Protein backbone atom coordinates (compact mmCIF):
# COMPACT_ATOMS: atom_id res chain seq x y z
CA UNK A 1 0.00 0.00 0.00
CA UNK A 2 3.12 2.31 -0.40
CA UNK A 3 5.24 3.61 2.57
CA UNK A 4 5.39 0.86 5.23
CA UNK A 5 6.18 0.08 8.91
CA UNK A 6 9.75 1.20 8.17
CA UNK A 7 9.34 4.78 6.81
CA UNK A 8 5.59 5.66 7.18
CA UNK A 9 3.84 9.11 6.94
CA UNK A 10 4.75 11.31 9.99
CA UNK A 11 1.58 13.00 11.35
CA UNK A 12 2.20 15.38 14.25
CA UNK A 13 -0.05 17.76 16.22
CA UNK A 14 1.02 21.41 15.69
CA UNK A 15 -1.34 22.49 18.46
CA UNK A 16 0.92 20.70 21.02
CA UNK A 17 -1.96 19.81 23.38
CA UNK A 18 -3.09 23.29 24.41
CA UNK A 19 -6.17 25.37 23.67
CA UNK A 20 -6.96 28.30 21.38
CA UNK A 21 -7.26 30.74 24.30
CA UNK A 22 -7.02 30.81 28.14
CA UNK A 23 -3.60 29.14 28.35
CA UNK A 24 -0.61 29.07 30.74
CA UNK A 25 3.05 30.07 30.24
CA UNK A 26 3.89 27.06 28.01
CA UNK A 27 1.34 28.13 25.37
CA UNK A 28 0.94 31.70 24.25
CA UNK A 29 -1.51 31.74 21.35
CA UNK A 30 -2.17 34.63 19.00
CA UNK A 31 -5.53 35.19 20.71
CA UNK A 32 -3.70 35.13 24.05
CA UNK A 33 -1.55 37.97 22.70
CA UNK A 34 -4.79 39.83 21.84
CA UNK A 35 -6.01 39.17 25.42
CA UNK A 36 -2.60 40.19 26.87
CA UNK A 37 -2.71 43.37 24.72
CA UNK A 38 -6.26 44.18 25.99
CA UNK A 39 -5.31 43.51 29.66
CA UNK A 40 -2.07 45.46 30.36
Partner 1 sequence: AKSKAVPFLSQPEALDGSMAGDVGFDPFGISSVIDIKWLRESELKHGRICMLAATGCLVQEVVHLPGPAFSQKMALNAWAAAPRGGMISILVAIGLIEMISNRFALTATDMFANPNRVPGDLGFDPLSLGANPANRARFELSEVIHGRAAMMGFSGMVHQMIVSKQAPIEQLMHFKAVDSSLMKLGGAAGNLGY
Partner 2 sequence: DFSAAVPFLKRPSNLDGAYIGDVGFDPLGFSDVFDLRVLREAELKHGRFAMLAVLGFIVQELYTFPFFPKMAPVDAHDYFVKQGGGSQIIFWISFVELFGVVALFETLQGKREPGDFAFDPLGLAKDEATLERYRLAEVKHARLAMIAIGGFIHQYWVTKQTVLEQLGNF
Tell which one of 13, 37, 39, 40 touches ligand CLA (CB under 6 A).
37
8 binds ligand CLA (CB under 6 A): no
CA distances (Å), 26 to each of 8, 11, 12, 37, in order?
30, 22, 18, 18
Answer whether 19's CB lies under 8 Å from 27's CB: yes
- Letters for 12-31 (x = contact with partner 1 by CB under 8 A, - = none) are x-xxx-x--------xxxx-
Comparison of 30 and 38: residue with beta carbon closer to partner 1: 30
- DSSP state, 14? T
Binding site for partner 2 (CB under 8 A): 36-40
Amino acid sequence: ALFGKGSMIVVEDPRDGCGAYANSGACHTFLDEIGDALKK
